Design a binder for this molecule. Structure first.
Ligand SMILES: CCC[C@H](CC)Oc1ccc(C(=O)OC)cc1NC(=O)c1nnn(-c2cc(OC)ccc2OC)c1C
Ligand SMILES: CCC[C@H](CC)Oc1ccc(C(=O)OC)cc1NC(=O)c1nnn(-c2cc(OC)ccc2OC)c1C
Lengths: 292, 286
């Protein structure tokens, strides 16, 4: 029911996704692991709240059948709250490098000015990373199952209703319940990627047109591949969750910048995305990875 | 009710224990961690344990051992257990060194006595941190919890060492009775290579007599009836287990090397030349 041009758009996105998403995290190697003034105090107080929302226990399953489990320390008002940030910095960097590869395979993204390619990836990196994380999220166990690595949310003593208070965790449970297809996920990634109102975009109109065509393909896909009455508003549900994911990005990018101030964790590539220190000059790593 | 000489002996032994037993394992660092075949496989499964590492920050690293698939996975934790045993032994060496009765012995007998009692004295110290209700050796920041096995206690108690640890804990001995057991085990005159048998045998007898006198002057209850003869029976049992597990350790060593340099000196059957590390540690000072 889709046009051939729409069918090819989905084929190119699914192809890019297959080539750049390591669903088993098999190539995520060599990562760090946790080891065995008044205004400045205000900055620390805000960071303590930020780190507490998304606390997870880490699990590593070995080839031999062993299981190494790490349980996060409870907040004792010290640098113990930053125990997993170095590992999460290596994971986010591994994910963003694959998100950069995803965009490069897409022909419509390659034909853009590289300044616009950097700005689109700078504004969408968190969003396409959470979208990929959602596909490995088990809502029954609250665990991101990333190959041998597993990340299980801790109970926080409140309940699933205390977890849903956190917009990020609510995004993951709600998106997982829509039970989207692989094609609908990759279309969400494209719609997020080709956001015309990202900071620094100059081809605003050209990018907006691309986004509209991706959304129409997703809208038409939902019409032609799902029972029409029951999934009548599924497209609008996806788009509203994409708008919420844009909001969550702004919150957590600023949470990450607060934590970076008091306690640096960012990798050189994540630093460029965060703006920590011309668009090409400020993003030399991202520029080189795109230029390849 | 004890003589002054007996009281001082208990006092020297308790002072040595406090100075040489790192009950928190706080100075146990830089240890390896996890990253004929039929005889070994059943042995290691009986003593299967999960490892827990609690951090200063409050974090907990837990290692669950792999199930026995018949491969080498059975010896996953042995490299770490060898570094643990060796740390305990070096504190045992320090314990002996401080004892006046032991330091005045010939260096050739200090090596021979410690060679024969090293396992026994470690297991005695391990029993003091053993929680029988949880089957977990609580070694400060490190914990070693016995993994579940079909049959439970019944099936695990078939392992002589686990049976020794559950039985010894049941006697709920005092620190004084533990440290005197260490001395009786240490000053074993019939250990291989001792040449001053009579001097060591005389020392052993006075330790045993002091232990008998301590129990009579401090433990009037019916549960502690025959407690001295029970303890002496257990020290005889631990000597048997020492031979079993020292021979089991040599079999596992042949197929899969795990022993530290100091343990290889222990297992190697001039005495000073054949035990160069143990010789150095004895000459070194507390
Ligand atoms: C592997 C499990 C995924 C889980 C799902 C939410 O996530 C966590 C769980 C727990 C923690 C945590 O408590 O450990 C301190 C942290 C994160 N999550 C990030 O650490 C993180 N996830 N995405 N990003 C990020 C990536 C960007 O480009 C790709 C750009 C900006 C970003 O953040 C603002 C980060 C730093
Ligand atoms: C922390 C609680 C210790 C627990 C109490 C029985 O024990 C184990 C539990 C589990 C295992 C295991 O399944 O790991 C794969 C191994 C051991 N136990 C030794 O590893 C061990 N205990 N003592 N010694 C030893 C020491 C010597 O002096 C340095 C000389 C010879 C020795 O052995 C013949 C060893 C190697």
């Amino acid at each position: 029911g889709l046009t051939e041009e729409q069918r090819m758009m989905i084929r190119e996105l699914m192809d890019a996704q297959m080539k750049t998403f390591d669903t088993t995290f098999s190539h995520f190697k060599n990562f760090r692991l946790p080891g065995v003034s008044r205004e400045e105090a205000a900055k620390w107080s805000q960071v303590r709240k930020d780190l507490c929302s998304l606390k997870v226990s880490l699990q590593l399953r070995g080839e031999d059948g062993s299981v190494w489990n790490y349980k996060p320390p409870a907040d004792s008002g010290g640098k113990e709250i930053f125990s997993l940030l170095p590992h999460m910095a290596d994971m986010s960097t591994y994910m963003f490098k694959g998100i950069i590869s995803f965009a490069k395979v897409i022909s419509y993204f390659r034909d853009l000015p590289i300044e616009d390619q950097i700005s689109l990836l700078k504004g969408a990196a968190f969003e396409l990373c959470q979208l990929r994380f959602n596909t490995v999220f088990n809502a029954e166990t609250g665990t991101w199952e990333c190959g041998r690595l597993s990340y299980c949310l801790e109970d926080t003593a409140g309940g699933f209703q205390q977890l849903l208070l956190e917009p990020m965790l609510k995004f993951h449970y709600m998106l997982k319940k829509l039970q989207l297809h692989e094609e609908e996920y990759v279309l969400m990634q494209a719609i997020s990627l080709f956001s015309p109102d990202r900071p620094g975009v100059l081809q605003h109109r050209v990018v907006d047109q691309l986004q509209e065509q991706f959304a129409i393909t997703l809208k038409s896909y939902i019409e032609c591949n799902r029972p029409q009455p029951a999934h009548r508003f599924l497209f609008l549900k996806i788009m509203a969750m994409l708008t919420e994911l844009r909001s969550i990005n702004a919150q957590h990018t600023q949470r990450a910048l607060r934590i970076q101030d008091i306690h640096p964790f960012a990798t050189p590539l994540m630093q460029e995305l965060f703006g920590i220190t011309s668009l090409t000059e400020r993003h030399k790593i991202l520029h080189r990875l795109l230029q390849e």
